[PDB]
Amino acid sequence: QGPVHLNYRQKGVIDVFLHAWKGYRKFAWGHDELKPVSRSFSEWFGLGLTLIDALDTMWILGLRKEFEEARKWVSKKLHFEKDVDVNLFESTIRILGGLLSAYHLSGDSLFLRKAEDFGNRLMPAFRTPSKIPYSDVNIGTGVAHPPRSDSTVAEVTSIQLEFRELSRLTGDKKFQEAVEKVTQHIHGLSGKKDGLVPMFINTHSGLFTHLGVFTLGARADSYYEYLLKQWIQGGKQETQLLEDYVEAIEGVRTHLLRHSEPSKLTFVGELAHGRFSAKMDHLVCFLPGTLALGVYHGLPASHMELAQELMETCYQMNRQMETGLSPEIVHFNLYPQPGRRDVEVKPADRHNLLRPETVESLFYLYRVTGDRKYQDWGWEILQSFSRFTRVPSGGYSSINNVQDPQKPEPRDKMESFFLGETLKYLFLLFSDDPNLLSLDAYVFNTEAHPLPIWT
Numbered sequence: 001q002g003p004v005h006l007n008y009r010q011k012g013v014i015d016v017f018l019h020a021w022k023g024y025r026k027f028a029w030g031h032d033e034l035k036p037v038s039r040s041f042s043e044w045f046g047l048g049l050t051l052i053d054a055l056d057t058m059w060i061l062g063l064r065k066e067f068e069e070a071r072k073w074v075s076k077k078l079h080f081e082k083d084v085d086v087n088l089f090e091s092t093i094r095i096l097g098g099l100l101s102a103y104h105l106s107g108d109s110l111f112l113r114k115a116e117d118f119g120n121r122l123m124p125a126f127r128t129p130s131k132i133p134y135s136d137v138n139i140g141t142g143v144a145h146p147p148r149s150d151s152t153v154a155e156v157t158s159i160q161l162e163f164r165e166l167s168r169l170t171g172d173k174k175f176q177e178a179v180e181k182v183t184q185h186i187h188g189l190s191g192k193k194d195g196l197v198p199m200f201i202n203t204h205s206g207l208f209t210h211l212g213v214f215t216l217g218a219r220a221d222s223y224y225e226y227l228l229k230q231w232i233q234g235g236k237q238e239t240q241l242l243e244d245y246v247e248a249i250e251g252v253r254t255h256l257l258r259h260s261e262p263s264k265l266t267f268v269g270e271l272a273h274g275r276f277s278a279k280m281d282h283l284v285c286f287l288p289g290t291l292a293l294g295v296y297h298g299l300p301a302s303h304m305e306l307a308q309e310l311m312e313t314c315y316q317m318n319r320q321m322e323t324g325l326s327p328e329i330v331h332f333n334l335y336p337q338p339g340r341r342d343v344e345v346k347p348a349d350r351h352n353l354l355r356p357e358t359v360e361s362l363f364y365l366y367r368v369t370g371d372r373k374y375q376d377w378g379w380e381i382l383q384s385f386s387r388f389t390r391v392p393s394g395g396y397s398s399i400n401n402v403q404d405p406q407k408p409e410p411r412d413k414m415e416s417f418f419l420g421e422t423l424k425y426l427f428l429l430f431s432d433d434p435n436l437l438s439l440d441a442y443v444f445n446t447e448a449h450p451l452p453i454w455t
């Protein structure tokens, strides 16, 4: 049984969370990720990733009993004295961000203590000549190093909210100073295309690499997101961040924005040495949300028009599929041809890993416009998750074929961001309380962990 006050859609999200958590608790407790189909688990860093990523979601959904049990695990089983290499970015947005939000929501100092411990262990990654951090760092030995080879731009520019907040709470300025150094370096770095940034950067030279190739998908997405979010977090005082964000959006309009045929769906493609590619990762669906968030905070009304158009397109990326779930990547038709549909998907990209981007943006579009249809769209997507990704014994799994409702083909994996992001954004989307994690008081990191806006 669940709280009587909850509207039916939030109640529904809770039901889904509980079924998902049932699987985690039974077959992967304390492990990074659940393997629902095989009733097993998988380890990435060995730091209870799914548990930490879901802490704030449990608190927000009112699952206090579950939260307490998870809190106990953090207190007794989470140890950073381990010989393991972690990705600075992935561990920052999930672990550091997740512990920080858990700390703020619960008021439990345990989470802050663990966050400060982890933050210190990540610092060796910034020990480079350019000060642009290495991609990986061994939290136990203290040695940092690049991938098995430069660092990716999104990775070094999407850890700022977390490190800035850790400094604010601890009084230890080294975290903030380290990440702000990278932000400042990126700002004056050449190699950009009207605000658009390359996907990689060399830690030794500190220069952009893989020049002339731009995308807002994997390897770059959150860079644009954090320009705006840092500005918001800092109390809208850091004009350079705002300016870079505004320039970037214009760069998007000028180089990556196109429309499909015959429906004229607005979308963002990729550019490689002058050649446009009508390819759009689902990851890019974070944009309408970020755009709307900006509008709420005073950005151009043109950003809102773009946000609504892209939200519609992202919704269609889901609804045009037989399962109602968007695939990993979607290609759009640019030229006139009758009978030719707008959305196309390659056989290799028909997987759905329970990603949050569409529901994330629906949350922002609803909060800013108050248009109930965005809630309706989110409810439809949740129905699809329940119908095609549910694992009877517990949990939900990524699927290989979004186009076959009879045989979706589970991949036997529940990404940590399903409980950390996807279900949190849906719960919030269904709330009709603008004061629940208000856009005026909190800013979500890129893994859906809310952090307080500074005064």
Ligand SMILES: O=C1N[C@@H]2[C@@H](O)[C@@H](O)[C@H](O)[C@@H](CO)N2C1=O
Binding pocket: 217, 218, 219, 221, 222, 283, 355, 356, 357, 417, 421, 446, 447
């Ligand atoms: O490329 C990725 N960027 C996103 C992240 O910003 C975050 O949302 C999840 O880690 C996950 C969600 O879809 N991320 C990716 O795999």
Ligand SMILES: [Ca+2]
Binding pocket: 222, 286, 446, 447
């Ligand atoms: Ca994200």
